[PDB]
Design goal:
alpha/beta, EC 3.1.1.96 (chain A), homodimer, six-stranded mixed sheet, two-stranded antiparallel ribbon, Daa-tRNA_deacyls_DTD (chain A), RNA-binding (chain A), D-tyrosyl-trna(Tyr) Deacylase, Chain: A
């Protein structure tokens, strides 16, 4: 699994059907663009959840990188992003094979969302809409982009 | 060098003057660019080449077909040492793998000139390198592309 984490003062998620409809809003917290790999195991998912929930990305008083999302009662917007497995090594049309197939990613993703809610709180974890087009207004703070790829652990 | 490429309807880059807008793009790419302590100019070339030609837009009835240049769109290159945020360590990131902020800025700027020489210099927007920015992005998709040159 691959995750791109961005720190936000807020995030607005719309889907279609005046044309766009808002279905998700966080204030301060993280947006996590989440890529599911074909061979991804549950130990991989737990690693994402751990870091998103536990990475200290906020200043507090004198100190920096001192406080994680939970410490400050912040929110989390988890969007699925298979394009993180867009292969671009070979020519310019990106290649998506290594990304887990949709029906299997959905069910995976949902386990992951549930686990987010267990490790933290239902009301703090926003999702979007799986494999549907989205319009996400993201107020980036800093900005701060963290990139983790679980296949780099073991 | 690392790059997070996001596809946007537009992006507004502000700094602390409470905020004041300094940069803006409409449809195009925001690119979060992490410079590595070892990066060569060839590393830069790959990111630049890829950012400009990766065909990340539909051309009605075809998918993944048009790049930023083709559609005459813009790019916002913003510097991100956070991309070598070392997160294996603990719950506190350190960022020692990034280029030290003086050689990084010189490098950055050189990249921007090349982004410019290769596209057309009215379409490359930047931020204030050293500074805190608040950047509102309208993610279009969304579509996030991740490239590390050390994976080649």
């Amino acid at each position: 699994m691959r995750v791109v984490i961005q720190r936000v003062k807020g995030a607005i998620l719309s889907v279609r059907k005046k044309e766009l409809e808002i279905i998700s809003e966080i204030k301060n917290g993280l947006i996590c663009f989440l890529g599911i790999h074909k061979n991804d195991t549950w130990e991989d998912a737990l690693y994402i959840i751990r870091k998103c929930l536990n990475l200290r990305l906020w200043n507090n008083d004198n100190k920096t990188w001192d406080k994680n999302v939970k410490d400050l009662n912040y929110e989390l917007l988890i969007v699925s992003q298979f394009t993180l497995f867009g292969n671009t090594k070979k020519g310019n049309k990106p290649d998506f094979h290594l990304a887990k197939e949709p029906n299997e990613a959905l069910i995976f993703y949902n386990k992951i969302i549930d686990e987010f809610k267990k490790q933290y709180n239902d009301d703090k974890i926003k999702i979007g809409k799986f494999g549907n087009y989205m319009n996400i207004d993201v107020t980036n703070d800093g900005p701060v982009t963290i990139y983790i790829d679980t296949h780099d652990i073991n």
